[PDB]
Design a protein around this ligand. Structure first.
Ligand SMILES: Cc1cc2nc3c(=O)[nH]c(=O)nc-3n(C[C@H](O)[C@H](O)[C@H](O)COP(=O)(O)O)c2cc1C
Length: 362
């Protein structure tokens, strides 16, 4: 029964503590999805985190519709990630790349192709483009040839992640994106082998996970799931019958660790009514389980104290607190984060969050 400050091994990744920086897209790449030098400074400032999970990073032009988000399918993107990773390693940190395919959460003006998903659905609301928000387009239900191509993309992205120096990768199977669209029955209306019974709805996750495992090794393969929230219109009516078996599959496949994002009943951006499945998932996935969402320092210590989690990932607190593990250890109050600069451009609200009384007061 450890504390947040006790080390943990995520496969071969020796993490000096159990404070993980959850994935957080910041939109600081260029229009070619190539990371900008400023991203090296952002990740370096937070290298005291036991493990960094990078922002969602697109596996392909097709799967990346968020403007100014980074990618990892091309040699140019690889060459740009290299000094970003090296700068975290220079401070002794560890960092994994979150491989992204956005599925239907995409706009054809960005990707160049119609949104693709498990079924031909339209997400509610508005999608970002380089020319402002636009209505979501109806998705195309991908076929077997599409799956094979998308599997190739995942492998090449996972291989490129390792080329860039990453200690591992995290498969984004959550948040209503491509894989989550297959997992949940509210969005998977397929009548073939990838829809219907829970085993069928996990088949795409299985095949994605198998390629990544075979590409970079199972000990360097983590996954993120979001079993209970209603994220971007993506929900499953009976999550237990799908997500518990999905986590059992991840165990059987040997994935080194699992992160769960679990909204509660009372939450800002994206909450829910469906209860968390971490206790049930905990019984089937025995390797490091990472829990994430509304965690305070106090609740995070409680989860490790109660054997309910191995580590805790922090998102919004790491935006505004580059030294989050030091404020936890030293009892320092935390900096609030400014939403306006979540997805803006430049260092403002990005690399100018101070760590100590060294700003305009030293
Ligand atoms: C790939 C990926 C990218 C994400 N990017 C953001 C982000 O840019 N901003 C944000 O508030 N949450 C983002 N999230 C959700 C957070 O990682 C996290 O799960 C959630 O914010 C938990 O809330 P917390 O920050 O209070 O811990 C992202 C999640 C994933 C999986």
């Amino acid at each position: 029964m450890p504390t947040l400050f006790d080390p943990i091994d995520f496969g071969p990744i020796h993490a000096k503590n159990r404070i993980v920086m959850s994935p957080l897209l910041r939109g600081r790449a260029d229009k070619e999805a190539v990371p900008a030098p400023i991203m090296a400074e952002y990740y370096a400032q937070r290298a005291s985190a036991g493990l960094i999970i990078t922002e969602a990073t697109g596996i392909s032009r097709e799967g990346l519709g968020w403007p100014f988000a980074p990618g990892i399918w091309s040699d140019a993107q690889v060459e740009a990630w290299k000094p970003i990773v090296a700068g975290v390693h220079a401070k002794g940190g560890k960092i994994v790349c979150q491989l992204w395919h956005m599925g239907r959460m995409v706009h054809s003006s960005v990707t160049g192709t119609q949104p693709v998903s498990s079924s031909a659905t339209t997400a509610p609301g508005e999608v970002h483009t380089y020319e402002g928000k636009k209505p979501f387009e109806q998705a195309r239900a991908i076929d077997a040839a599409d799956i094979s191509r998308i599997l190739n993309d995942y492998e090449n992205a996972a291989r490129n992640a390792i080329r860039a120096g990453f200690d591992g990768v995290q498969i984004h199977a959550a948040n209503g994106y491509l894989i989550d669209e297959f997992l949940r029955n509210g969005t998977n209306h397929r009548t073939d082998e990838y829809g219907g019974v829970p085993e069928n709805r996990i088949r795409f996750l299985k095949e994605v996970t198998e390629r990544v495992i075979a590409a970079i090794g199972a000990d360097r393969t983590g996954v993120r799931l979001s079993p209970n929230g209603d994220v971007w219109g993506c929900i499953d009516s009976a999550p237990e019958t799908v997500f518990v078996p999905a986590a059992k599959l991840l165990q059987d496949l040997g994935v080194a660790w699992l992160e769960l994002r679990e909204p509660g009943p009372n939450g800002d951006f994206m909450k829910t009514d469906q209860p968390k499945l971490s206790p049930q998932i905990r019984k089937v996935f025995l390797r490091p389980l990472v829990l994430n969402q509304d965690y305070t320092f106090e609740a995070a210590q409680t989860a490790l104290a109660e054997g309910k989690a191995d580590a805790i990932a922090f998102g919004r607190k790491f935006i505004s607190n580059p030294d989050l593990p030091e404020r936890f250890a030293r009892g320092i109050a935390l900096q609030p984060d400014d939403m306006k600069t979540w997805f803006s451009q430049g260092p403002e609200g990005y690399t100018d969050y101070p760590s100590a009384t060294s700003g305009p007061n030293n």
